[PDB]
Amino acid sequence: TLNGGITDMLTELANFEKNVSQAIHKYNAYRKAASVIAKYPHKIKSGAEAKKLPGVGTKIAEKIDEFLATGKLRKLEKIRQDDTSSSINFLTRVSGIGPSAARKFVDEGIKTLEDLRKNEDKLNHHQRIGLKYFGDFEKRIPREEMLQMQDIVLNEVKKVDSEYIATVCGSFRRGAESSGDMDVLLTHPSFTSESTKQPKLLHQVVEQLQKVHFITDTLSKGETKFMGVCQLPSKNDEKEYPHRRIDIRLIPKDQYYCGVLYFTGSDIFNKNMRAHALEKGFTINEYTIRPLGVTGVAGEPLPVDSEKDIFDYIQWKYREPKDRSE
DNA sequence: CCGACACCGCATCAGC
DNA sequence: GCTGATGCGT
DNA sequence: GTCGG
Ligand SMILES: O=c1ccn([C@H]2C[C@H](O)[C@@H](COP(=O)(O)NP(=O)(O)OP(=O)(O)O)O2)c(=O)[nH]1
Ligand SMILES: [Cl-]
Ligand SMILES: [Cl-]
Ligand SMILES: [Cl-]
Ligand SMILES: [Cl-]
Ligand SMILES: [Cl-]
Ligand SMILES: [Mg+2]
Ligand SMILES: [Mg+2]
Ligand code: NA
Ligand code: NA
Numbered sequence: 001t002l003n004g005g006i007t008d009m010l011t012e013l014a015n016f017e018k019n020v021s022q023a024i025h026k027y028n029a030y031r032k033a034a035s036v037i038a039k040y041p042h043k044i045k046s047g048a049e050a051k052k053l054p055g056v057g058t059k060i061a062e063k064i065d066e067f068l069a070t071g072k073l074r075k076l077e078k079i080r081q082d083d084t085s086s087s088i089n090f091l092t093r094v095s096g097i098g099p100s101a102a103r104k105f106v107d108e109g110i111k112t113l114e115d116l117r118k119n120e121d122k123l124n125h126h127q128r129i130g131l132k133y134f135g136d137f138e139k140r141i142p143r144e145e146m147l148q149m150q151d152i153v154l155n156e157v158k159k160v161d162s163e164y165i166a167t168v169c170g171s172f173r174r175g176a177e178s179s180g181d182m183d184v185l186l187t188h189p190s191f192t193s194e195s196t197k198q199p200k201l202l203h204q205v206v207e208q209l210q211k212v213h214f215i216t217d218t219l220s221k222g223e224t225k226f227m228g229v230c231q232l233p234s235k236n237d238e239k240e241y242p243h244r245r246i247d248i249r250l251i252p253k254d255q256y257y258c259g260v261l262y263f264t265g266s267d268i269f270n271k272n273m274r275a276h277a278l279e280k281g282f283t284i285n286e287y288t289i290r291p292l293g294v295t296g297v298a299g300e301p302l303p304v305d306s307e308k309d310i311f312d313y314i315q316w317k318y319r320e321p322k323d324r325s326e
Numbered sequence: 327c328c329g330a331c332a333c334c335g336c337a338t339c340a341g342c
Numbered sequence: 343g344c345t346g347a348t349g350c351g352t
Numbered sequence: 353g354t355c356g357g
Pocket of ligand 8: 170181182183246247
């Protein structure tokens, strides 16, 4: 965090472009800049210096000079004042409420936590759960707590079918000391890119987890992706643990390595990796790595038996999960 | 310039 | 109902 | 907002 101040500014700017300006690309642009600067091993002294890095152009260089001289950014000063912007930015913090709905709600006079609570009838299922755990969801998960959660999940999944394989990915697999949520990659020999010899594969596990009261709510649920809420149990007289977001993803067992690579992240790392893949003539998703034909159409999935094989194809030296935190 | 920017599952909608 | 666009978080 | 051709 040598440049904590700058990356914060950039991040704040990215949020404004996404939530207020609904400018997907300016948002991603700022995120890339905050990222590349976060890994820069020197306390940046000027915009010039920063512009040397990819993703940091002329505009951001100007802003960094302003930030270093004054210790702040006028553009953000104003944005903070603007009520509409402050409102939209706040509402988007509720899971399920994105830039559009945020702007719409403000248009209705619904712009505070108070306003949302007395207007639940105006929220879809996801938004209502997001408002319900507004506090909890903004809290971080200590890794120790992640270890307890991992234990419960792997053991409850084992009890359903000894052939299930559950791996905790995301920041946890990257070794983070705290996580925003718990992500679980699941596989069962019955479900492959070839056939789904068994139904309810994900259901059964969600069910078992709800039975032991681990999972408490469901934001969304399909045959392969489950987005929900969970909570570790507490001891006698002990205050209850905060509710945590949980994501489970069922992937074909034969496509495990593309899945684990994807679910391990980070998001920006995957973005930079999928970009390089494209510049190399390939395309990568959570299922496979395919080559790209002249026309641009993806071809047949190339053989993969390790995460490293994927890195090889794109001519990238292997990077351990801990080193993919961009 | 200026086109491209990673990729996709589930919820919800309009239009038929 | 089916299908495709769009929101949202992934 | 930034980049490569
Ligand atoms: O835009 C996205 C979001 C997530 N992902 C992948 C990578 C990420 O590590 C993984 C898990 O998603 P989370 O949103 O849980 N991210 P992560 O676990 O890295 O961070 P956090 O600790 O905030 O949950 O999904 C993407 O590829 N693109
Ligand atoms: Cl944009
Ligand atoms: Cl500022
Ligand atoms: Cl694979
Ligand atoms: Cl695929
Ligand atoms: Cl996902
Ligand atoms: Mg996560
Ligand atoms: Mg997650
Ligand atoms: Na640059
Ligand atoms: Na939100």
